[PDB]
Amino acid sequence: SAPVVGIIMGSQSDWETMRHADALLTELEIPHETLIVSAHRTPDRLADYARTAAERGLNVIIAGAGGAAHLPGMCAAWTRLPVLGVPVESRALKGMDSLLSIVQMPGGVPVGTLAIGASGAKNAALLAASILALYNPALAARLETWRALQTASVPNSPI
Template sequence: MAKVGIIMGSKSDLQIAENVIAVLEEFEIEYEVIVSSAHRTPERTSEWARNAEANGIEAIIAIAGAAAHLAGVVASESNLPIIAVPVAATSLAGFDALLSMVQMPGGIPVATMAIGNAGAKNAGIFACQILAVKYPHINERLKKYRQSIKDKVYKDNETVQEILKERKK
């Protein structure tokens, strides 16, 4: 069964991680969550990343703010796809985390999402897309999900048109 690893730099990142968890649960994908810091617990972080594949993890989502070296450290220790979510944890509003994640040296890629909640949701969806290559049932769920968000836009348009129509009366 597909499994995603979620690693957070600190407990305060759980609020952002909840967006990832919601997506994975919607798609019925197993996950594990760990708090481990690239700076405060580097040995634990490296060990977890090195063992992730052996533990059945097929993609990793790293969530961190500030200097945000977490995704890069994990990527240096694992051949699994790494998806980074920057968190607005300092006065730089997440820009520092974004740059730390997106400016990886050639050869150690990290797929970096947007800062915060939208990035976390997209990280969950991106993990599903990665897994969909191997698992047809996840691919089918992605197709249904895409159709549902498309349908919502059409429905929202109808609602707006009705509101505007009523305004003209």
């Protein structure tokens, strides 16, 4: 029941994208919390969140942000937990700024980065699931089923 995955985003505007991560986790029945934490507007909230993540039982953190996206990186700076970053598509630069701002982390503080947009949010949840599956037999079976269904469901020819 207690969340093992924390999904955080810089603002309501990121929800359209991050909701895909939320749906995936719920789908696979992975207890998680979905919150808004702004690196730029609520820096202390971020520090406290990341710093106490481990103590609270969280195992993985999924963070999404766009533009000069610092949320994932700074979160990773305050936690020993794996941090997965989702580059939210920005209006002007289409998430290229979001991508470089998140993926180009200097050695020492990692952020496992996913694709720009919805695909990245969904994949961050799947990656978080594959991580949790390493020590959760039941979830591992559900993930196997999920991947198996994805594969089996692909049509043989276009409509």
